[PDB]
């Protein structure tokens, strides 16, 4: 079952169809090479234990529940809305009580009655698509797979493959 306490899987980035461009083992870290002493077995793999533990906690707090590593499209509720709020325009003119003045021979280039109009306005409809880059970090905390490739295929992460498509369940790269 358990084969080590393994290095996390770092997800890549992409210009977003809703994929995270697969993931791959972290190889910008030690903790699985050689040369030190045998008294560092609980001084260097206690480190690696600690890193993984911080990851499980970190992922659980900051990540929405999902049935898939890469959903390929987040719902409109779960993209995180950063769209603007309402605003007000003070309209500069009467055009229904300072136009009978120009018909009355007045040329123009606030002296008539104190009618001033305020107009409200809103902002866009919800969008569904790939996740933002600020919210990529919180949705893709590195994953620790603790029993690598154990059990039947069909519970293996195939979403760590940067060629896989989960809405056709095939890997096609045209190579």
């Amino acid at each position: 079952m358990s084969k080590e306490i393994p290095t996390p899987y770092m997800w890549s980035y992409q210009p977003q169809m809703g994929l995270a461009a697969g993931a791959a083992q972290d190889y910008s870290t030690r903790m699985n090479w050689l040369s030190a002493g045998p008294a560092m077995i609980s001084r260097v793999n206690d480190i690696r234990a600690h890193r993984n533990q911080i990851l499980l906690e970190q992922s659980a707090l900051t990540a929405t529940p999902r049935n898939h590593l890469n959903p390929r499209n987040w719902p409109a509720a779960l993209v995180y809305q950063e769209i603007p709020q309402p605003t007000t325009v003070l309209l500069p003119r009467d055009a229904q009580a300072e136009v009978q003045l120009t018909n009355s021979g007045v040329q123009l280039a606030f002296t008539p009655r104190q009618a001033v109009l305020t107009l409200e306005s809103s902002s866009s409809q919800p969008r569904s698509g790939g996740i933002g880059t600020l919210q990529f970090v919180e949705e893709f905390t590195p994953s620790v797979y603790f029993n690598p490739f154990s059990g039947s295929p069909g519970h293996y992460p195939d979403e760590f493959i940067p060629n896989f498509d989960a809405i056709s369940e095939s890997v096609d790269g045209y190579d």
Partner: protein, 50 residues
């Protein structure tokens, strides 16, 4: 053959419109969800090789 320029002058044409119609439009297109976007007809990286 030689070419001279005397007078390089800039012209602009404005659609006359109400200053309430005009000012409504300004507020609409000062939102970043109403950002204008444009793209080249031939959008390409152009590379010449001998």
């Amino acid at each position: 053959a030689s070419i001279s320029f005397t007078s390089i002058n800039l012209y602009a044409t404005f659609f006359p419109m109400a200053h309430n119609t005009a000012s409504t439009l300004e507020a609409m297109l000062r939102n970043d969800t109403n950002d204008q976007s444009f793209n080249d007809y031939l959008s390409a990286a152009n590379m010449l090789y001998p």
